[PDB]
Every structure is written in C-alpha cells, then in structure tokens.
Design a protein around this ligand. Sequence first.
Ligand SMILES: OSC[C@@H](O)[C@H](O)CS
Lengths: 334, 335
Amino acid sequence: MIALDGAQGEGGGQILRSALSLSMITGQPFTITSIRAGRAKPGLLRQHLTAVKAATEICGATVEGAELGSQRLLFRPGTVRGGDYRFAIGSAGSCTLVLQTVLPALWFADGPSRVEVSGGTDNPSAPPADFIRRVLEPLLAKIGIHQQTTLLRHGFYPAGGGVVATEVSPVASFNTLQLGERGNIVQMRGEVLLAGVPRHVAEREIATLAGSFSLHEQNIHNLPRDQGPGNTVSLEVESENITERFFVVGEKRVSAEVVAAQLVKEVKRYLASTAAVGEYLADQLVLPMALAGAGEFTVAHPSCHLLTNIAVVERFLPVRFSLIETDGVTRVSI
Amino acid sequence: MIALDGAQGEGGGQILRSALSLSMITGQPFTITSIRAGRAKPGLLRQHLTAVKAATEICGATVEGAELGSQRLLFRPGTVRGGDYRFAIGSAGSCTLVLQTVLPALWFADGPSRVEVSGGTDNPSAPPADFIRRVLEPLLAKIGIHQQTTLLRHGFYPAGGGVVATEVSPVASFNTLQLGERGNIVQMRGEVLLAGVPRHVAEREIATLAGSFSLHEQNIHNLPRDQGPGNTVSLEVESENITERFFVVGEKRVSAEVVAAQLVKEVKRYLASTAAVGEYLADQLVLPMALAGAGEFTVAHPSCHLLTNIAVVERFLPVRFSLIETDGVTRVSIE
Ligand SMILES: OSC[C@@H](O)[C@H](O)CS
C-alpha cells in the first residue's frame, strides 16, 4: 500500500492517472490524498471519476472515495483483463486522458483488448487524441508494445461526439529505446484539419507554416460538418532518429494566423534545441521506459510534469531515473 | 519587454514574487498573464498585492493591473532606493513572502535599508520567518550578501501579530559559494518555542527528539501568552560545510509526540541522502548564486519549485543552470 500525496509537483490529475496505471500493472494498491487541493473545483471532478471507473472495470478494483469533490481515494486493483471495452466521457472530457489511464495496464492484460472512448478529441488545452497514433505509437512499437489507435470521429471542444478506438496486445518483452540526437531533418509536413470552418482558414494557416518552413506536403483534411465547428493544425518534423508532430487546436475567437503562428513558434523551439523529444512526449516515454528497465531520451528542459511522472513511477517500481541537464539538453535515463 | 505566463511549472505566487525581485534588480520591466489561473481564488490576492505594493514603493514603479482578481500585471521598475520601510500583511499573511520579494532588490539599492514587516511568522504550511536568520543568512553572507533578520515578535497561524525586521547593505562584491557534500556531522541542537502552551508539551517534544538523536543542546523558549497560542519545534544539523535547521509548527489539536515525530521524519529524510541542502533551502539559493554568476549546491531531488525559480531567473539574468541528478543526489551549478 503506497500512500500518495496528491499535492506533490503541479498537484493535479496527472498524479492520479499515472498511479491508477502503475497500480494496475504492478497490482500494488494505493491511497492518494489532497487530490487537486488548490484548484478552483477541488478533488475528483467528473472526468477523474470517469478515468477511475474505467480503470476499475478493466481490473475489477475495489475503490473508496470515488465521488465528486473527494480528496481521498483508495484503489485496490485486481487482475487486468482483456476484451472489448467501450467508455463514454462525453463532455469536455478528453479521450486522450482515459486512454493514457487504461492503455498501459492493458499492455499487461490477460489477452488482447479493444478500447473505445467517445468524448473530446481536439481541445486547445492539450494534445489531441491524434498524438497517440501519430507520434506515440511508433515509439511504443520500438519498445516492444503493440498498440494501434484509430480516430474514428473527432469531437472538437466544446462539442463532444468524437470516437477513438485502440487495439492492444499484451507485451512479451520490452526493448530499450535510446534517443539522444534527433539526427538531420528528413522532411516537414503540415496538415490542417477542418470541420464546418471555411477552407480559406486552412489556406491561410498553411501559408503561415509555409512562410517559415519548407514543407514536403501541405494537407487539408475536411471532415463532415456535423463534427464541427473545428480546426486543428499540425506540423510533422520527421528527423533521422525520430518523428515528432506538434498540434494547435484552434479556438473560437482566435484567427487563423494566430493559431498558425503559435504552431510555428512551438516548432522553432523544438528545432532550436538538439533534444529528440518535446516536453509532452517526454512525459509519456517515462512509464514505458520504466517498464523496460532501461532506455533514454533527450528533452530540452525538465518540466514539472516530467518530475511528477518520474516520482510516481519510482514509488511503484524499483527503477530510478537519472537526469543530466547541461547544454540546453537534458538526458533522461534509467 | 519580458512576458511571463504565470501558469508555468507550479502556477502560483512564487513566479510573481521572483519576477518582482528580478525586475527590480535588473531594471527590466515585465508583464505576467494568467496569474494563479487554476486556483480556487485566482489572480492577485491580498498578500500578492501587498507584495507588489512593497516592491512598487522601494523602486517607484509604474504598474498596471494591481487589483484583486487581476490575472495580468505589468511592472516597470524605477531605481531601487535604500531607506527604511514598513509593510503590514496583517492577516495570516506570511512576513517571509514580502521579505523574499524586497530584500533581494535591496541588495542592489543605492544605500542601506531596513525592512520591517508585520503579519504571520510561524505557520504549519511553510518554514517560519526564523529560517531566514538561522539558515539562509549565513549562506548569503558567504555569497557576499550582508543582511540580518530579527524576529521581534511571533505571530502564530492563524493569527498575525508577529513582527520581523531586517537590515541590509548593498552588495559590494559577490562570491562563489560551493556546496558539495554535507561533510561530517558536527552537532545537532533541538529547540522548542512555546506561547501559551504548557511546558510539558515542550518537554515531550524535546524527549521525542532525544529518542532519535543525540542533542548537543535542548532549549525551551517560552514567549508571553500575548503571542500565542503557538508551538514551533526545530532541529539544527550543523555539519562541517553546512548548517541546516528544520522546523514544524504545531497545529491546533496535534499531540506533542506527533509534532515532534513529523520533525524527526524531515530530519531523517535529509540525513537519508548525502545532499548538503533540503528542498526549501535550495529554492532560496538559486537567485543569489545566479547574481554572483557562479556557485553550486547538492539537493536530494529536483522539485517543481526549484525548476520554476531557475526558469524565472534565466528569463532575466544571463546565466544557465545545470542539473546533474545521479546517485541519489542532484548537483545544481550556475554558469
Ligand atoms: O501542537 S502544539 C499546540 C499549539 O500550537 C496550539 O494548539 C496552536 S493553535
């Protein structure tokens, strides 16, 4: 029984989701207190409750404290099972966050699984569901993890409606991933996703990307208007050792040029370091690498989220992380 | 103009307080948006406003957005002035947070200064005002920074009422401070402060510390009932190369033994690693070494607070921190 203080690091939902995952994998139960204690609406909100129930269902846990506003939670996992799971988060609800809770555990399930989640997929506060398939999965495959995500329908905040489905197989063995240098840029590509939003908005965004970067491809993907309004712009940087993809989800009163220019600045900050992975992808490689007992990547700067994922992993798993930050590059390794 | 998002890293008052200090010292103005945006009560609160106000008063600043609830502030410092100031936070408000906002700028003031603040000195959520003289100041003195704090009266949470006074002289020259290893134990000293709490409670507390450590001294300090109720227990670990002091502020209905065991726990934690400084103290040396331009320390683990301080510092000052975390300890060095 691990006792977690939910007020470590940035002190929000990340602590809870990472522990839920690690509890399921390791079978170690846990209690967490001060869940989001300083936030406007403190304790477990409806989205956290959704994540806890999904976890509960895939491993038959026994739970105490799973109620709105609760600041305490006790989770005692059972055996992780395979099979066809369908969850509904709806609302703002990020698909991504349910998936990040349950996917790692399903890697240890007793058989293959399929996880369907309906809810938001594209929201300006966080990387879209599309980041799983396009950036995360190919690095999971090299670690020896079998996970294939399909966006079946986008749900653009504030609208829900999106549909994501991931197929997963139990891992046989973990490989050691070693990322240091990106390597030379092989190609960049820009894509605009549109649903119920005029075409010219994608032509302008694509032209702002094209003003700064040489693009191998300039794609405009139009979705059915029933999924809109929505606009997402992404830029892929395929280097010799890694493929990264950066995303800006467009907001209601923001213009095309401002959405695009935020994307351009994020890409130039990645290119300005020699680090192989961006901040957010760095947070997601922590667990799979912990799980393999070895591996490394470079990230520009350690972040609070990186520290917190590392701390929660180290409570459940006997691995230790080293962090050697020295020349505008931080090497993260087992 | 330096633009800061106040939602980075930890997302709270710390970012604001360090940018105030750094803007004053260097003369660089800044704006900060999304001040405390995720919090229960977001943006500028009373305590934050008291800190912007004291800062505006020591340097004659041009300020926009200094209001309750604002999530945006713009601050354009004038010349830091030496003089004698008095700030009242009252409430529970901690004197340390005002002090930590103006003292560093006063090291670059055009003459000596004296800061007096009134408000809370001893609260369960943070090291007492007493940490400044007992811990930090000897260290600032080796960095070439001359300041001396006095506890004139204690204000124990949830009451204010305490008074702290600091004297500062502008720095003439910075020095490189290098902390590696703690070195060997030299002595350990226990102390309990009481205000309107039976002496038996202090005795119990010293006797629990005495149960885990060899105490070279064991003082008990009774304050007038005036300043209570309150009870602060502390334990100093003087090693050859560094001295630390860890404190607990006893909470309303919490046993003597439970107060003291919390304190034994933080001390054994610090002694479970070979780092020279605990997390809190490492957070305090970032700015002063950045200003000297060179320096290093070891801390067991990097925390969010430490990262936040280093990133605000590197936005204003032409320095870069390196973090080498390897065998249970992190070396933090500035270049
Ligand atoms: O834990 S010691 C007790 C003393 O500090 C008072 O009860 C504070 S309100």
